[PDB]
Design an enzyme around this catalytic site. Sequence first.
Site, PDB file in Angstrom:
ATOM      1  CG  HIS A  62     -10.700  51.913  46.123  1.00 55.33           C
ATOM      2  ND1 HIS A  62     -11.453  52.415  45.057  1.00 55.33           N
ATOM      3  CD2 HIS A  62     -11.566  51.238  46.905  1.00 55.33           C
ATOM      4  CE1 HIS A  62     -12.723  52.099  45.213  1.00 55.33           C
ATOM      5  NE2 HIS A  62     -12.795  51.370  46.323  1.00 55.33           N
ATOM      6  CG  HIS A  92      -3.104  53.253  51.580  1.00 51.42           C
ATOM      7  ND1 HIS A  92      -3.527  53.344  52.894  1.00 51.42           N
ATOM      8  CD2 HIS A  92      -3.355  54.470  51.026  1.00 51.42           C
ATOM      9  CE1 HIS A  92      -4.013  54.569  53.101  1.00 51.42           C
ATOM     10  NE2 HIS A  92      -3.920  55.289  51.965  1.00 51.42           N
ATOM     11  CG  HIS A  94      -3.175  57.947  47.739  1.00 51.79           C
ATOM     12  ND1 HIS A  94      -4.512  57.752  47.574  1.00 51.79           N
ATOM     13  CD2 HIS A  94      -2.929  57.818  49.093  1.00 51.79           C
ATOM     14  CE1 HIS A  94      -5.080  57.515  48.767  1.00 51.79           C
ATOM     15  NE2 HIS A  94      -4.141  57.510  49.703  1.00 51.79           N
ATOM     16  CG  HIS A 117      -1.709  58.159  53.101  1.00 51.31           C
ATOM     17  ND1 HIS A 117      -2.829  58.422  52.337  1.00 51.31           N
ATOM     18  CD2 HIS A 117      -0.914  59.271  53.069  1.00 51.31           C
ATOM     19  CE1 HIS A 117      -2.717  59.676  51.848  1.00 51.31           C
ATOM     20  NE2 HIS A 117      -1.601  60.211  52.283  1.00 51.31           N
ATOM     21  CB  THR A 196      -7.803  61.092  51.193  1.00 52.70           C
ATOM     22  OG1 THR A 196      -7.149  59.858  50.944  1.00 52.70           O
ATOM     23  CG2 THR A 196      -7.013  61.984  52.123  1.00 52.70           C
TER      24      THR A 196
HETATM   25  N1  LIG Z   1      -6.092  57.655  52.345  1.00 52.49           N
HETATM   26  S1  LIG Z   1      -6.771  57.015  53.620  1.00 52.49           S
HETATM   27  O1  LIG Z   1      -5.664  57.008  54.748  1.00 52.49           O
HETATM   28  O2  LIG Z   1      -7.982  57.726  53.949  1.00 52.49           O
HETATM   29  C1  LIG Z   1      -7.146  55.333  53.333  1.00 52.49           C
HETATM   30  C2  LIG Z   1      -7.202  54.813  51.970  1.00 52.49           C
HETATM   31  C3  LIG Z   1      -7.138  55.473  50.770  1.00 52.49           C
HETATM   32  C4  LIG Z   1      -6.930  54.797  49.612  1.00 52.49           C
HETATM   33  C5  LIG Z   1      -6.924  53.514  49.506  1.00 52.49           C
HETATM   34  C6  LIG Z   1      -6.837  52.635  50.529  1.00 52.49           C
HETATM   35  C7  LIG Z   1      -7.041  53.332  51.791  1.00 52.49           C
HETATM   36  C8  LIG Z   1      -7.007  52.620  52.918  1.00 52.49           C
HETATM   37  C9  LIG Z   1      -7.214  53.114  54.213  1.00 52.49           C
HETATM   38  C10 LIG Z   1      -7.375  52.199  55.349  1.00 52.49           C
HETATM   39  C11 LIG Z   1      -7.576  52.668  56.654  1.00 52.49           C
HETATM   40  C12 LIG Z   1      -7.684  54.107  56.825  1.00 52.49           C
HETATM   41  C13 LIG Z   1      -7.451  54.943  55.783  1.00 52.49           C
HETATM   42  C14 LIG Z   1      -7.219  54.454  54.404  1.00 52.49           C
HETATM   43 ZN   LIG Z   2      -4.339  57.218  51.695  1.00 51.73          ZN
END
Ligand SMILES: NS(=O)(=O)c1c2ccccc2cc2ccccc12
Ligand SMILES: [Zn+2]
Length: 258
Positions: A62, A92, A94, A117, A196
């Site tokens: 992702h 991470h 986007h 994020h 997200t």
């Molecule tokens: N965007 S998010 O914070 O909900 C999210 C991810 C979204 C994209 C890819 C990896 C992601 C990893 C997360 C890991 C822990 C909590 C939210 C995360």
């Molecule tokens: Zn994220």
Amino acid sequence: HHWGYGKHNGPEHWHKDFPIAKGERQSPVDIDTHTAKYDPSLKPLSVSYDQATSLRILNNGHAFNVEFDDSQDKAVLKGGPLDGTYRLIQFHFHWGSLDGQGSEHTVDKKKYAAELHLVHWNTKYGDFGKAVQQPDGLAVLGIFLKVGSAKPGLQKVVDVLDSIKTKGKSADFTNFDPRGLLPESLDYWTYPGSLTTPPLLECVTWIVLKEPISVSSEQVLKFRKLNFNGEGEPEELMVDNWRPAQPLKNRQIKASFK
Ligand SMILES: NS(=O)(=O)c1c2ccccc2cc2ccccc12
Ligand SMILES: [Zn+2]
């Protein structure tokens, strides 16, 4: 036929497996700056990353995740809108196929090139998997990226990406200091929302910084060389891994400044 960002399994399909996608506190959202209200009761954010211990970087199919040791109470976020203390677990990004898109939150409909994020879980719930089951379980610090001057503190991340090109690859990634990813100002907007990506749980207090960081065109270009596919599968560049803005519904976005 698992979820993704692709032509057939992207955000507009997620509600079939995850009906909370159409819920009352989904993220991201557009931040309409004129209507967000300054809240003098909000406190400065407290970001304490001086003991943060990174372990590994993972291409999860992702995004890529930079993972932290969260077994001791280091690297914590508190203050701001939060009650109590939240411990950093991972960060991470986007990002887009083009510099003109890539962020999840928007600001008066402006899309940034990317969005960072930093994910933290509320220590009152003991670990991340219990925290995500609670409406105040996570605090995610969101930071916009625009393309301009390089971010020197990002380069170590950029340079390891060639070693995690494809889904399921990881690499050791110790001693990375996330302070080098922060802008100068900690002025922010905040609102209650969600993860997200599936499972889209409504467990996040969002804290989105107003000031973007600048990264260079070459840095973001290297993000876009990652792949969503695994090794030995046809190449699908990891680009446009952002969910669009969702309906604000019965929420208020509050500003820490002005
Ligand atoms: N965007 S998010 O914070 O909900 C999210 C991810 C979204 C994209 C890819 C990896 C992601 C990893 C997360 C890991 C822990 C909590 C939210 C995360
Ligand atoms: Zn994220």
